[PDB]
Amino acid sequence: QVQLVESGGGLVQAGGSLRLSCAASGFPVYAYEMYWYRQAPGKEREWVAAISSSGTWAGYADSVKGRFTISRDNAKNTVYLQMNSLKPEDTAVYYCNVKDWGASWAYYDYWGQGTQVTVS
Amino acid sequence: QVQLVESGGGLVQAGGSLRLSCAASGFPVYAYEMYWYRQAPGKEREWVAAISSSGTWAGYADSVKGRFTISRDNAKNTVYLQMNSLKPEDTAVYYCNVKDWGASWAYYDYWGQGTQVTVS
Amino acid sequence: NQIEFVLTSVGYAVGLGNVWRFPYLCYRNGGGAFMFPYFIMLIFCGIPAFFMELSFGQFASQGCLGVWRISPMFKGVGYGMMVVSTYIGIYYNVVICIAFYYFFSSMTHVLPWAYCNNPWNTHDCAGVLDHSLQRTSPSEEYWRLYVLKLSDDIGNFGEVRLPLLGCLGVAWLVVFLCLIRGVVYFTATFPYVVLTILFVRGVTLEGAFDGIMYYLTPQWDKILEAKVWGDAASQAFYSLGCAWGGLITMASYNKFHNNCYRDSVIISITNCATSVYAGFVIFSILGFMANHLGVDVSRVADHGPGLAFVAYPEALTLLPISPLWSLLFFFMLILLGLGTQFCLLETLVTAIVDEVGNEWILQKKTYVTLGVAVAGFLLGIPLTSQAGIYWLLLMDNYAASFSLVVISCIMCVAIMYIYGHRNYFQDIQMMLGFPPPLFFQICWRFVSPAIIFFILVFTVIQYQPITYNHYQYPGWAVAIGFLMALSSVLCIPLYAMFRLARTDGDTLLQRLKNATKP
Amino acid sequence: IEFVLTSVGYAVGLGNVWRFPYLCYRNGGGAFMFPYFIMLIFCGIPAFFMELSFGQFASQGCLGVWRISPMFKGVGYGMMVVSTYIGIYYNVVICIAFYYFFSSMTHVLPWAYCNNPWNTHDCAGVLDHSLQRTSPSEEYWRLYVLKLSDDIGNFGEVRLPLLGCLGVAWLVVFLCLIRGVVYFTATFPYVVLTILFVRGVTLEGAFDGIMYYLTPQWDKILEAKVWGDAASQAFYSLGCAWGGLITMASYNKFHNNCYRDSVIISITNCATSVYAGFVIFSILGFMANHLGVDVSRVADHGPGLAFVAYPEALTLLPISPLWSLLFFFMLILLGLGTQFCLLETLVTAIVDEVGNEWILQKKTYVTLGVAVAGFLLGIPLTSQAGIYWLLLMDNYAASFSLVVISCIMCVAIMYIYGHRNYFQDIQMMLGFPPPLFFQICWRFVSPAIIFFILVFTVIQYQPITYNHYQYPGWAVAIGFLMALSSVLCIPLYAMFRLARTDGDTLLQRLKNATKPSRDWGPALLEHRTG
Amino acid sequence: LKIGAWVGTQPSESAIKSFQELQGRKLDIVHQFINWSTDFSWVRPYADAVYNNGSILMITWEPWEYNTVDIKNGKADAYITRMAQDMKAYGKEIWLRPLHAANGDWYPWAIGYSSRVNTNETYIAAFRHIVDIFRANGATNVKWVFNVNCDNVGNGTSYLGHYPGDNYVDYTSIDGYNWGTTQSWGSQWQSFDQVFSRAYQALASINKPIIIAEFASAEIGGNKARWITEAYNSIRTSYNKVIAAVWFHENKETDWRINSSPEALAAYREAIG
Ligand SMILES: CS(=O)(=O)c1ccc(OCC(F)(F)C(F)(F)F)c(C(=O)N2Cc3cc(F)c(OC4CCOCC4)cc3C2)c1
Ligand SMILES: CS(=O)(=O)c1ccc(OCC(F)(F)C(F)(F)F)c(C(=O)N2Cc3cc(F)c(OC4CCOCC4)cc3C2)c1
Ligand SMILES: [Cl-]
Ligand SMILES: [Cl-]
Ligand code: NA
Ligand code: NA
């Protein structure tokens, strides 16, 4: 059922900007909170951003806040992460995520394909 | 009536593992407690293991405890002795046994054929 | 010292009267169409009558029956307040039964009302975690078909809901066993900390603005409909405790020189601040249900009773670790109702006993409390039926809507024009030091009885038969609605027929001047 | 510590080693455990503490204490009737214990094999054909120990070996009544039960037995008789409504802590009832796969479920005859002790109504007369149709009647004598008043539970069965006549009292007869209304 | 007959069992003394152990700094109101015994005092003022205990003249002693009746329970162990209105201790046992 697909990554210089996009299907996404994570090669999965079902509140990691800007459009069933003022440390595989609790005490992590961003 | 039939021994190196098997016929073995003994060439017969009718409790000799794993399946009418981490001292003729009291004050020792295990 | 004394007032300003009932009434008459009539009726008529019921009982230091010494003829007002209390006490408990049902039903690894996979669900069903022109929510169907197998008419009682009849055991035992026996930091903060969790959820949902907009933006085209004021007068008077009798009974124990002015303002202010916050969270959830079901906020649910039990469960399902929060939420509603029931029944038993006199009935005080609980259970059985909410509404929006407004207004007439406003404003000054403010003095003598009078007149004219979710009530059910609504109000004229027979004078006017004077 | 084992010893006996497992089976394993604990906690223990306190305070026997409310002494007489039905059938259980004991004195136990003549082709054998299978123990019992007939009417001829053991079982208690070690008599029952418990769990199928014993049946909770038999068992196993609790506690010191006694006795009573069921059902779990029969229908029996199952695990023990000698000897000493207390109680009660040493010097001849009578009345029980009658007493005569007799006492004390007066009486000898759990249990929970169970049992009555054999109309009628023979002592004695007493009026003569006798209360210092 | 005692020093856990083991019984009541310069934050660490142990705390309150005039006028209301909100929060049944040994000439708050500042008319108004503060505050777990010395000591002393009525007092206690021949002023052997017979007879008119709140006997005069046996025999027979008996265990000035001699310890262990 749940499918998440992404686009907009690639290779860029230090000081550049990229607009990662993610589209979501198989479930009513307008009632879910969307998350973005990054895992550098060999290193573990760091958190990057999270956005509300409405889009009133969004929260960012301490190494990201104010450089990037998350946004979404629930009409298209999409979440976007606008990345600006990129630096060599942002070189990681960026994964779209949603945590489905299932009205239960535990949650299932649904994941995207992982779109690369490489910053020279 | 009572017949006991071992299989599965042989020759092995020090550090190897062998699972001896014994099948039982002519009597309702699911209500009996099965035992295994070993008698090295020329030396007397030592005890090795014993298992309950249900298979809740099993007991062993101190030179065996922490190495061998006894088990049984009352559907097949079989008892097994999974003899892990074998050593040169385990070189003996292994005999399957059952002690039938006969609802009396004395017991008859029914014995298997004796299957060799030789460890080098 | 004085901070701990604040939370006591905050605790009396929250309960099932405004967490469950205020959002449903605000929706039934229409979001912004009820807010403007509510604030006007609460400020001009609600708060001055609230301060009068505290002052009246604290000065005299007598309960809702004995306080009518100021005019022995009007003691039929005091009896009428017990009738209002007896209707509220038997139906308010089936609301607690349903809070228990959802509480116990929350004791699972997965909440049941989250999904469309269950047998009772129809092909219409929409699902938030998972076909038709019309759409229904998982919660809207779980309620309407599993919790209460709602029949097509009042006459169709079918068979009692055995799980609810069992809870109606627990909900009567749990108050009774507390009345025999009978912490402000937990009981005053816990209702607000849990309401804030759901409030955060409600606003962060898509469509919340379209819900909030409907709740706040006013309808000047709908403000000329008499019933919008009738239900707004009912809610302002119900939520404060007016015309139940309990305010006169609790304040009678209260010290003579207590500043009941500081009390009436503080209680009523944080009552409005909590009424608006409880509506705010509901309507923000309805705003999400609107786009989700593809129908307008004007049309998304339109239940009278049940709106809390259709919307809060639905909000709860989108919270992370959802069963944890639903256990706390329904437990909160339960402790809120049990407290207001302990005060409702303690008031009522004390008022039977004041009239019987202390000897013999003070031994019986537990066996009458037990008898009251047994009676409320036996009279609460048609409410646990397959036609439950049809009757629950008929009491809540007839027997106990507007009768609270006339009973507390006849008190205002009999004190202001017959006892004397001049005498009464001096009585307030003896225990407060200062006289009643100029806002209250005019509200009592002119604004409140004229507003209450005009609303009464136009509601009699603009009469149309009552509906629950586009189902119109039959002639013989709304007749019982009238008979209950005026059963409590007729206590005023009926007791006067008995008084004028007993009293001395043997004349037309002099016997009235004898019976009316203190 | 030595004072603990005395309480442990009173908490074990034939009432829960033999009779608890059989009742737990008939009504369904898990289906009886939940009703048993509820009836024991709410109705069993408070009535048990009341029968000790009632006796200990007044310091007078089973009959004499009813001068608390002199009209209700018909309750005191009724308790003797319950004792007289128990005493004559409880001894044929001891006879069968003697039979298996003496029959164990061989080189090989007989019930272990299918080779014996009485065995049918059906027989399964543990150590050694048909759609249905039977165990060698199940056939030894059913055909050799007791040649069971097809009906109650078919008495055939008395089992001479059992009739002989009935003489030994009466002599061995009688000769102890003339004459009359806690470390052995309190540990020996538990050390031997533990041996069989170990055996019971180590058998294949034991889990399927244990599962049936513990896992509850919410579909079977709505059946009135499940509560009737659970109420009977909770009240029977403690000693309530036999009269012996009032008689033994009457000797007891005034200021003894009977609260500490009633909790300690009843707790290790339940802990032993569950352990004795646990071993039985674990053996029935083995017999289930062995016979290829579902656990529920291995033996939908009556009394035999100890004599059919314990002999089975005994065959499975090494040096089996050694253990069977100890096990049946244990059951024997358990029954003889409870019979000694049952008969001593009864003779003391019967004698004290009649002139001191006008009949108190006949204490010997009357004890002998009681033993002779119990033998002559126990003869139909040693018949070919034995266990059909043994059950008819044990499920009618001496079963639910214990629940109503101990409840009429609770009504008589709480509403007519006064709960207010009674809670103050307990405080005079304990120092503290009765706990809030007991105060409400006595006035509301127990009389309503016992009342409702009575009402629904009268409605949901269906004729009784043993191993799916239904009882005939004449036999169930005698069941009713015995069951109410002991209860009608209450109304019948009141007809005699109201005739004797003064008043010559409708209500005043009742208010005279119901209020306490003028001679009431304890001895010397112990007064606070005098 | 609730048995209790003072325990030589402040009753904390290391101090209470020292006594409970000694008498071979759990103390039903524990006694403590505090002056009007101690806040409940100092009492609470001790009071915790008393209720944990399974005992009621009997707080003797000594207004050394405040007389019957200042208390009734409201000079000390900051302390009383602050105390009313600590015991109401604590919720445990605390038997507060204020303005105690009232008919003596040894206390600043006592009537017979040499200054003659506390009249039999101002004491009642001071006792009722304190009780009215705790009642207006809502402290319902403070059972007030009135106290009389066994004799009328001083200028204008009486048993019931300083009584605030059954409407303000919950228990009417007696403090008595048997000094023997220890004191160098003129003291004699007094049996229980020759200390308490008059004090019980004056209080017997008031229908309230009588607590014996300080009592003890010295060794040096006659027979302490006999006094002990016969004292409880008196409490239990003629003195039926008594509900508790609190001993005084100390050797700061006189050997009040029950274990003063090996023959006296067994007398107490038999009187309570
Ligand atoms: C806020 S709500 O959720 O809309 C609601 C509605 C109805 C309520 O029942 C009214 C009642 F049950 F209380 C009754 F019927 F007794 F009045 C409640 C409710 O529990 N209480 C409001 C209130 C008002 C007071 F003034 C009061 O005493 C004070 C203290 C002592 O003397 C001076 C005042 C105590 C209570 C508690 C809340
Ligand atoms: C467990 S059982 O096999 O099912 C069973 C059933 C009934 C029993 O007696 C019934 C009867 F008691 F009615 C009788 F046997 F006398 F008829 C017995 C049985 O032997 N006794 C019950 C009991 C109860 C006590 F509390 C008691 O202590 C007294 C209390 C005061 O401190 C010392 C003494 C002593 C005895 C002895 C076992
Ligand atoms: Cl409101
Ligand atoms: Cl039992
Ligand atoms: Na409230
Ligand atoms: Na025994």
Q: How far is the CA of D29 from the centre of ligand 2 (A)?
A: 26
Chain centre to alpha carbon of residue C86: 13
Q: Does B33 touch chain D (CB under 8 A)?
A: yes
Query: At D192, which amino acid appears?
Result: V
| CB-CB neighbours of E16 under 10 Å | 22
Query: At C357, which amino acid appears?
Result: G
Q: Does B89 touch chain D (CB under 8 A)?
A: no
* Enclosing H/E stretch for E3: strand E2-7
Per-residue DSSP letter, E142: B
Are C49 and C242 in contact by the 8 Å Cβ rule? The answer is yes
Copy the structure tokens of residue D217. 């049946």
Are C93 and C333 in contact by the 8 Å Cβ rule? The answer is no
Copy the structure tokens of residue D443. 């006035």
What's the residue count for chain D? 530
Q: How far is the CA of D86 from the centre of ligand 4 (A)?
A: 16
How buried is residue E110: exposed, middle or buried, by Cβ count under 10 Å (0-12/13-18/19+)?
A: buried
- Cα–Cα distance for residue pair D332/C421, rounded to 1 Å: 94
Task: Pick from C340, C344, C346 the residue to mutate for probing ligand 1's pocket: most ligand atoms within 8 Å of its CB.
Answer: C340
Ramachandran area for residue C114 (φ above 0: left; ψ -120 to 50: alpha; else beta): alpha
**Is B100–D127 a contact, with Cβ atoms under 8 angstroms apart?**
yes
Which of C197, C191, C238, C166 has the alpha carbon at shortest distance from C339? Answer: C191
Collapsed DSSP state (helix, strand, coil) of residue D207: helix
- Cα–Cα distance for residue pair B51/C309, rounded to 1 Å: 59
Strand partners, A69: A82
CA angle D197, D198, D202 (to 5 degrees): 115
**E strand segments, A1-120:** 3-7, 10-12, 18-25, 34-39, 45-51, 58-60, 69-73, 78-83, 92-100, 108-111, 115-119
Are D429 and D57 in contact by the 8 Å Cβ rule? The answer is yes
Per-residue DSSP letter, D143: I
Domain boundaries A3-119, corresponding CATH code: 2.60.40.10
Are E99 and E125 in contact by the 8 Å Cβ rule? The answer is no
| CB-CB neighbours of B14 under 10 Å | 12
- Cα–Cα distance for residue pair D139/D520, rounded to 1 Å: 58
Q: Which residues neighbour C155 within 8 Å (Cβ) at sequence distance 6 or greater?
A: C387, C474
Query: At D337, which amino acid appears?
Result: G
Query: At C390, which amino acid appears?
Result: Y
CA neighbours closer than 13 Å in the CB half-sphere of residue D19? 27
How buried is residue B102: exposed, middle or buried, by Cβ count under 10 Å (0-12/13-18/19+)?
A: middle
- Cα–Cα distance for residue pair D286/D302, rounded to 1 Å: 20
Strands E242-249 and E2-7: parallel
Strand partners, E60: E33, E97
* Enclosing H/E stretch for D30: helix D29-39
CA dist B38 to B55, B64, B95, E81, E145, Å?
21, 11, 6, 88, 86
Q: At what angle do helices C226-240 and C448-461 cross, to 10 degrees?
A: 130
Backbone CA torsion sign across E118, E121, E122, E123: positive
Q: How far is the CA of B90 from the centre of ligand 2 (A)?
A: 59
Collapsed DSSP state (helix, strand, coil) of residue D241: coil
Are C10 and C188 in contact by the 8 Å Cβ rule? The answer is yes
Q: Where are the domains of chain E?
A: 1-273
CA dist D329 to A103, D98, D238, D324, Å?
62, 8, 23, 8
Rg (CA), chain D: 24
**Is A31–C128 a contact, with Cβ atoms under 8 angstroms apart?**
yes
Collapsed DSSP state (helix, strand, coil) of residue E244: strand
Collapsed DSSP state (helix, strand, coil) of residue D465: strand
- Cα–Cα distance for residue pair B111/B96, rounded to 1 Å: 6
Query: At E74, which amino acid appears?
Result: G
Each as own residue / partner, the long-range contacts of residues C161-166 (CB below 8 Å, 24 or more positions apart, any chain) are C161/C384, C161/C385, C161/C386, C161/C388, C163/C101, C164/C94, C164/C97, C164/C98, C164/C101, C164/C384, C164/C388, C165/C381, C165/C384
**Is A31–C292 a contact, with Cβ atoms under 8 angstroms apart?**
yes
What's the residue count for chain C? 518
Which of C282, C500, C305, C317 has the alpha carbon at shortest distance from C400? Answer: C305
* Enclosing H/E stretch for D469: strand D469-470
Chain centre to alpha carbon of residue C153: 25
- Residue position matching structure tokens 């690894």: C109
Query: Chains meeting B at 3+ CB pairs closer than 8 A?
Result: D
- Residue position matching structure tokens 């737990």: D24
Are C46 and C264 in contact by the 8 Å Cβ rule? The answer is no
- Cα–Cα distance for residue pair E232/C47, rounded to 1 Å: 64
Copy the structure tokens of residue E26. 């759990």
Collapsed DSSP state (helix, strand, coil) of residue D319: coil
DSSP-derived secondary structure for E174-186: EE--B-TT-STTT
* Enclosing H/E stretch for D247: helix D244-251
CA dist D509 to D110, D220, D415, D512, Å?
66, 47, 18, 5
| Main-chain dihedrals φ then ψ at residue A50, nearest 5 degrees | -150, 145
Nearest-Cα distance to chain C for E7, in Å, is: 34
From the CB coordinates, do chains D and A have 3 or more pairs under 8 Å?
Answer: no
Strands C471-472 and D465-466: unpaired
Each as own residue / partner, the long-range contacts of residues D158-164 (CB below 8 Å, 24 or more positions apart, any chain) are D158/D379, D158/D382, D158/D383, D158/D384, D159/D382, D159/D383, D159/D384, D159/D386, D161/D99, D162/D92, D162/D95, D162/D96, D162/D99, D162/D382, D162/D386, D163/D379, D163/D382
Q: Does D126 touch chain B (CB under 8 A)?
A: yes
Collapsed DSSP state (helix, strand, coil) of residue C249: helix
- Cα–Cα distance for residue pair D141/D135, rounded to 1 Å: 10
Strands B115-119 and B92-100: antiparallel
- Cα–Cα distance for residue pair C284/C215, rounded to 1 Å: 8
Supply the residue whose CA is at minimum distance from atom 11 of ligand 2.
Answer: D244
* Enclosing H/E stretch for E248: strand E242-249
- Residue position matching structure tokens 């009394």: D303
- Cα–Cα distance for residue pair B47/B36, rounded to 1 Å: 7
Longest CA–CA span in chain B (Å) reads 44
Contacts of E85 in chain C (CB under 8 A): 1
Collapsed DSSP state (helix, strand, coil) of residue E221: coil
- Cα–Cα distance for residue pair C43/C442, rounded to 1 Å: 13
Chain D CA closest to residue B57: D202
Nearest-Cα distance to chain E for C516, in Å, is: 36
Q: Where are the domains of chain A?
A: 3-119
Q: Does E204 touch chain C (CB under 8 A)?
A: no
Are C218 and C35 in contact by the 8 Å Cβ rule? The answer is yes
- Cα–Cα distance for residue pair C303/C300, rounded to 1 Å: 9
Are C452 and C489 in contact by the 8 Å Cβ rule? The answer is no
| CB-CB neighbours of C107 under 10 Å | 9
| CB-CB neighbours of C343 under 10 Å | 18
What is the SS3 assignment for chain B? CCEEEEECCEEECCCCCEEEEEEEECCCHHHCCEEEEEECCCCCEEEEEEECCCCCCEEECCCCCCCEEEEEECCCCEEEEEECCCCHHHCEEEEEEEEECCCECCCEEEECCCEEEEEC
Are D99 and D162 in contact by the 8 Å Cβ rule? The answer is yes
**Is E136–C1 a contact, with Cβ atoms under 8 angstroms apart?**
no
Copy the structure tokens of residue C382. 């048609």
Cβ burial D137-173 (10 Å sphere, 16+ → b, else e): bbbbbbbbbbebeeebeebeebbebbbebbeebbebb
- Cα–Cα distance for residue pair C354/C368, rounded to 1 Å: 13
Each as own residue / partner, the long-range contacts of residues C67-73 (CB below 8 Å, 24 or more positions apart, any chain) are C67/C248, C67/C252, C69/C518, C70/C415, C70/C419, C70/C518, C71/C414, C71/C418, C71/C419, C71/C515, C71/C516, C71/C517, C71/C518, C72/C499, C72/C515, C72/C518, C73/C495, C73/C496, C73/C499, C73/C500, C73/C503, C73/C512, C73/C515, C73/C516
- Cα–Cα distance for residue pair D289/D295, rounded to 1 Å: 8
Q: Which residues neighbour D495 within 8 Å (Cβ) at sequence distance 6 or greater?
A: none
Size of interface B-D (CB pairs under 8 A): 60
Say what the resolution is, in angstroms. 3.9
Nearest-Cα distance to chain A for C315, in Å, is: 11
